[PDB]
Structures are given as C-alpha cells and as structure tokens.
Amino acid sequence: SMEQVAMELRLTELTRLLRSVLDQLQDKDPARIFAQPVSLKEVPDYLDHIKHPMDFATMRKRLEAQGYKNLHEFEEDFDLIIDNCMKYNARDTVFYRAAVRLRDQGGVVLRQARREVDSIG
Ligand code: NA
C-alpha cells in the first residue's frame, strides 16, 4: 500500500538524519575510545560487569539496517556507550573522562536533533 510506502520513506529520512547525528557524535571522540566493542578477549571479565555493551560500530550496523524507529531508541544506545564506560572505569581514568566529555559535547548535537525530528515529523 501507499500508506506502507510513506511510513518506509519516513524511516528512511529518520535514518538519514541519525546518520548525520552519529557522525557528529563520533567526531567528538577523536581518540576513538568508543569506536568499537570492548573485546572479551582483552577484558574477559567485561560482561560480568556490563550487561548491555554498546559502541559506535554497533550503532552504525543497526542504523544501516534502519533499526532505529525513533530518536529515543538511538539516544538509548548512545547513553549506553557513556554510562557503561562510567561504571567500568574509575573517575581518575582517561576512559571515564572521555565519556564525560562525549556526553557534554553530544548533548548539544542531540538537542538540535530532537528539534529537527519534531519539526520535520
Ligand atoms: Na565504577
């Protein structure tokens, strides 16, 4: 049906916008601390600590399958990246501090993303 097609075009345009958001967030991580999953070969104890690992590559896979239905879902995964790092790593570490700086800088990007999603529909 045409109504199904129109819903599919909307998901496609959300996907486009979330790709630009994902790129902008990821530029805020020039060290590439959050680029890839934590390897269970190098942090064997990770999944004892962190129940829902997340990283930018994982998000990009989901996005490319149009797997985010709304901005809230995308934000959930971005918050996992930050919040997982802030739990596993101590305050005095480069990892924790990188997560704080990503959260702060990413707030800007997500604030306008929300306005664009609401405005375009
Ligand atoms: Na901790």
* CA 4 to ligand 1 centroid distance, Å: 46
Q: Could you tell me if 14 and 117 are in contact, meaning their C-beta atoms sit under 8 angstroms apart?
A: yes
SS3 label, residue 44: coil
* CA 47 to ligand 1 centroid distance, Å: 14
* CA 40 to ligand 1 centroid distance, Å: 19
Task: For residue 45, give Cα distances in angstroms to 20, 42, 50.
Answer: 34, 9, 9
Measured on CA atoms in the order 82, 107, 117, 20, is the torsion positive or negative?
A: negative
String of b and e for 81-108 (b: at least 16 CB within 10 Å)? bbebbbebbeeeeeebebbeebbeebee
Delineate the domains of the chain, giving CATH numbers in brackets. Answer: 1-121 (1.20.920.10)
* CA 88 to ligand 1 centroid distance, Å: 5
